[PDB]
Amino acid sequence: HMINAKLLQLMVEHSNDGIVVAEQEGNESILIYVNPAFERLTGYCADDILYQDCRFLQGEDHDQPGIAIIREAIREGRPCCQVLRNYRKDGSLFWNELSITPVHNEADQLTYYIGIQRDVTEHQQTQARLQELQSELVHVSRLSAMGEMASALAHELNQPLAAISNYMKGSRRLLAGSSDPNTPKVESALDRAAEQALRAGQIIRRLRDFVARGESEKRVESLSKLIEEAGALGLAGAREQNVQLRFSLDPGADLVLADRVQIQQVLVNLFRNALEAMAQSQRRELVVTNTPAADDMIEVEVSDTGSGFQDDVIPNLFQTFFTTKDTGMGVGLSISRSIIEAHGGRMWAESNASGGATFRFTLP
Amino acid sequence: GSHMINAKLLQLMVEHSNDGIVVAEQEGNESILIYVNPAFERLTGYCADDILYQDCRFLQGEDHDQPGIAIIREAIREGRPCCQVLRNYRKDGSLFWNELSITPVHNEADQLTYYIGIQRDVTEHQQTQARLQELQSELVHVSRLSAMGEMASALAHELNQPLAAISNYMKGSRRLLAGSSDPNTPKVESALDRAAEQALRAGQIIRRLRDFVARGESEKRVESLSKLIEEAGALGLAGAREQNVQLRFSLDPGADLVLADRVQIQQVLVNLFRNALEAMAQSQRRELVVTNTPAADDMIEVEVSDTGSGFQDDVIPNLFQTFFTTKDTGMGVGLSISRSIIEAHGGRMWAESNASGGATFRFTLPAA
């Protein structure tokens, strides 16, 4: 009615989406029409596949749940939409998003199907890599958090336990020049206490090294790449926070020597920290910049126009547990600085002229 | 001339496609609708007789601050196809997310530019994906502090004995020295007192770090088991479809409502889900069953069974022990944290090996 069927067929012939019309023959849903987009998407020529069921796109990959879903939809005559792994003529893998509508033709007294196919490989791939990045971020965050927990405990307890040892040493020195009948019992009690204090030391290290066990290696990685991976994790939601992102990367300074999951976590933490300082900020600008630097290093700058620093907050930032947030562990910057310095770099912070914060670090 | 099928048949298929399909026509800066299928009238709530020969942009309502709109405008300015999601609004005002595929097509007879547009309602995917973004952030935060907290509790528990020992050896040494006249004894006693004070200080500063990390604590509310199971699946079980892992959630409608702290039970379930997937990595059978049932003393029992690596004969009684692990990079902390959280809540928790060589974990929660 509304448009002539020739024109409509022309539109179908030239749609960018795969479009096919199938016909049920017993247990087969045989293709009776395909458009060029479908030939492109699959690599098959229409002259070759007509009057067969398209399941050959599955190749040998028949342990997919969508397949059974589709089969039951087709038995019921209900529509259905499913993603499947299909394989082009040349073998190449693509994820095919299938929308099938059973349609009953009264004249033919037959059941046809109209199917729309979109290649969704890029979405599947990016979503899978984002899942792996999310999982590994969780893993490394947990071990590194317990790992800083241990080091702070060791360094804070190091003084009392040594004091105890020294008081044992001095007491034993005083009692040596004594004949009181009870002193051998005193000396043995003091020895047992010494041993217990050593035991406290030895087992603080035991839990530390169990949580800190298992370390990685440093390889050449592109900062553009690790900045994009870190942004994918840390900066989703900037647009909803109306934060303006600017990545100024120097093409001569892009390749660094680093352990990629740890630098990912340094950048993710810096990005999150910057977003938080912009929670209620009138100006929201985030700048990431790479430049050549002095000691054959390369400097990465992350600047925000956020809450910034009070007069004497700035010199505490990288100290373990120093925090201004109600639920902050104050550990992000401490872990980041220890990681960067172990990688051969330097890290420091300063307030920006816009009232925000600028963090810089260097890597080779 | 090549006609694989009569155009009437093709028109019918389009008429009954479950997908919105429209044909628009270029008139200057308008792409006016000249055909819509019933699917589009349903999806949008508008009647063809009313929207024909207008541009579809009225679906944006007042919500024109979307990037996809400018993307589409440029694609249509060039001759290129494009695909974008928009916030559109039905006739009744209701919001829906519309997945648009537009293909400009040039008609030689008309010497005109038409467009074929395919529209999918994808509200559920956009919303679900945004809720997974929210869950990912909270899982990171809660895992970090929760691990720091089990770290803290473990260090305090192991140190409790030596520090008490030191305090007691001081108390006993002072008792022995009380009856003494050696000239040096007041100096000894003062040294022992200072050592006592240092050991107390070690204790108090361990409690200091423990309380600092556990300072973020919450309250427990009535929560739907379907929902918290789905959030945990969304985080932990996202890869099962590609791992060819068979998932089955059998939830009993008579056993559904619990009292819990939702983020902590989420982290318990996420750990169970990942752990089961890890066991079912290289197993010919990989089937995971989650089941809800009523359980004794006004409780509800949840079962998670896997056909995975399972448990050795005497590993089972170690599972809930802090730091007990079999994985090279594992912390052995997941189950210890999980059991302490559930028991700190109103339930209990235990484990057993599965008959398929896998593992089955069960827990109970209240509904009071």
Ligand SMILES: Cc1cc2nc3c(=O)[nH]c(=O)nc-3n(C[C@H](O)[C@H](O)[C@H](O)COP(=O)(O)O)c2cc1C
């Ligand atoms: C119109 C239509 C299009 C289809 N397109 C595809 C496709 O592109 N790729 C694919 O793997 N399966 C596709 N299928 C599914 C198979 O034809 C078949 O129905 C499905 O694999 C379940 O049937 P089975 O029991 O033979 O496996 C399509 C089905 C229909 C009706």
Ligand SMILES: Cc1cc2nc3c(=O)[nH]c(=O)nc-3n(C[C@H](O)[C@H](O)[C@H](O)COP(=O)(O)O)c2cc1C
């Ligand atoms: C075939 C076709 C279908 C369209 N369908 C929709 C739609 O369903 N919802 C929507 O918001 N925009 C839709 N658009 C986009 C608008 O028609 C318009 O192209 C877009 O809003 C950008 O143009 P503008 O600058 O006038 O806003 C469609 C465009 C075409 C060509």
Ligand SMILES: Nc1ncnc2c1ncn2[C@@H]1O[C@H](COP(=O)(O)OP(=O)(O)OP(=O)(O)O)[C@@H](O)[C@H]1O
């Ligand atoms: N861009 C910034 N703007 C303002 N303050 C910042 C910025 N970056 C860091 N800070 C300050 O430095 C402190 C330390 O941050 P750090 O990331 O080390 O821990 P945190 O974010 O407080 O805790 P968590 O371990 O949960 O991330 C923060 O409390 C914050 O006050």
Ligand SMILES: Nc1ncnc2c1ncn2[C@@H]1O[C@H](COP(=O)(O)OP(=O)(O)OP(=O)(O)O)[C@@H](O)[C@H]1O
């Ligand atoms: N579903 C499961 N299938 C097989 N083994 C399991 C399962 N759940 C737990 N285990 C075993 O119990 C041990 C303790 O697991 P838990 O989840 O507490 O810590 P983990 O997985 O070792 O460490 P992490 O905290 O890093 O996940 C694990 O090493 C694992 O061997």
